[model samples]
Target chain A: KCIEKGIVVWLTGLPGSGKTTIATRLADLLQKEGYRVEVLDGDWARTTVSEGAGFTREERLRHLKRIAWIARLLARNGVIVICSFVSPYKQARNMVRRIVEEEGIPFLEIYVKASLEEVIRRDPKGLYKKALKGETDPYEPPENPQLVLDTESNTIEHNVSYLYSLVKAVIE
Target chain B: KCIEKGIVVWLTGLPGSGKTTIATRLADLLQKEGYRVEVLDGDWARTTVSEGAGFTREERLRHLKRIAWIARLLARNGVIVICSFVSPYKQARNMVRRIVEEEGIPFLEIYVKASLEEVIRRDPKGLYKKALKGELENFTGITDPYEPPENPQLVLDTESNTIEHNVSYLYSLVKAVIE
Candidate 1:
């Protein structure tokens, strides 16, 4: 009895590591294939639902907790959730994974890896520049992720193909 | 263009008027019928989620708002929500109705109207007994007002009508929008 299991594709990386870019395409591709897709982008969530919060440590935990709550609720109903956030801390990411797994839902942690120098060069959100100038709080890159993709070294098509296979394997 | 139009059926009435009793049966039936159904009991929500919230006018609005948000999200994802709460206010009910309509989702307000005296006699939760002794504040029947749904789509007479009749009528209404 192959009861459909829920998938939580957790994408995390430093700024400009292409987590959101990859997640967006992954959600689109999954939707095109007729799967229920729920993508929780960090910036969008902060702008809307978690607008009252800031980037403080506790606030970061709150944001992650709320996202996990929504993910759990939707996944229980059989929707595939793709959460893209910095989730830079190892313990914090594991906390979310533990909550979902305890509920019998499958969660995947994809860490987009790139050298700090390369990420600083991209500086998509200007965070890398701020970090260099000591104007922003530093983010520790995810260590020992379930799967790691070096954004600077990997092409979009390559990451997308890998993500698709990972999701298919989990759902199948 | 049905596009996952989820329905939230709110069965509102006094305590012991078969609100929870009926909703429990409906929840079971919906689950057996293979429909994704969740029942947010008034008692449970009050104790857990809205525990700190009082029963003032603004508090009631906040309570209704929380339920509406949950219902809207569930409905969008193709789940039938059966939220049974004593949400007895014209303005608050209208606010929720407008939200569901604005989202283009189907909402069926089933008003379970039962007499205060009959509910008092039934005393499913012993609410009336406490209210009579002035032990309960802002009780729905004895203390607070229950604005009998003026313009609801379906109004069930809990005191006079059989449970099967209400269930059958509600099932028919839900069936029309589910597929």
Candidate 2:
């Protein structure tokens, strides 16, 4: 109840690039160690907090900001919030960082990197297939992140283990 | 650290009807007792969480629902959320009640009631004066309707009761919720 402060672990990636997969794994890992954990998935955010928001550039920014705002609140209130989103814009990710960090809460930007073709093959939910037909949204890899977990070469556990220790080191 | 469970204390009434005063005082009392508390005020919400919202009937409903949603989240996270809103329509307050109570959370709807004449006389923020001048549009109790809550857990009136009396009684109601 006392040794740890809350932090936001933001995972940004293409739809099939393992953002939610890694986030859920990381959340469970942290919760097992007795930390309060919550995963703010893009789907959940869109359905709940940012409901009725569309995919227009302006609407998308509002949508992502809503989640960012909620993440900031949760992080400030002492919950380890892991956010998973296909938040393709660099500016959007930066907004989350600025808001969360403004409160002296720790913010971790983890890019779950995977190529357009590689993610198309993995196609966890056929969203990448739709992305191919329309590229639903453009994805720009984070230029500078706390860490970049390459899904092409790393197992989900390998990536989440790095996240686990990274957060452990920072919270202490 | 954990004896009391979270509750939603929703105070609904006309603008300048003392919802804010009662909520702020109640929040202070609860916080002193070591409870986690957050006040969701109407203006602060419109500028913050419900930024793009307008005053159209549909937009207003959406605005209040957004606060209800946020309050639900905070209440479930062990924070005693005190929401102060005009929430003019009965349907809107009921929606808030439905959402918070869906999570097995306690919801207390307190109607801070006052006659239109009394509130316009009080006109704490000079809002009623503006509404009277036709400068304000969609103003509740003036241009729009203020459908009071038919069934509220508590009813407060400043015309007779002092602020301390209202707050003290309100504190007693919340203590029952915590118990």
Name the candidate that leads on TM-score: 2
Sort candidate 2 into its docking category: acceptable
Candidate 2 colliding pairs: A131-A135
Backbone clashes per model, in order?
A: 0, 1
Please provide, for model 2 over B68-114, each residue's C-alpha lDDT reduced to its tens digit, 9 standing for 90 to 100: 77777767766788989868889988987998899888999998988
Q: Whole-model lDDT, candidate 2? A: 0.79
Candidate 2 per-residue C-alpha lDDT over A1-92 given as tens digits, one digit per residue, 9 for 90 to 100: 42324889999988778789899988888878867777988677655567665677877777676677777766665678898988899998
Candidate 2: list runs displaced more than 4 Å.
Answer: A2-5, A121-137, B128-135
Q: Pick the candidate with the highest lDDT.
A: 2
How good is the docking of model 1, by CAPRI class?
Answer: incorrect
- In angstroms, the error of model 1 at A33 is 1.2
- Model 1 regions lying over 4 Å from their true place: A1-3, A14-17, A42-66, A87-92, A114-144, B1-5, B13-18, B41-69, B115-146, B162-165
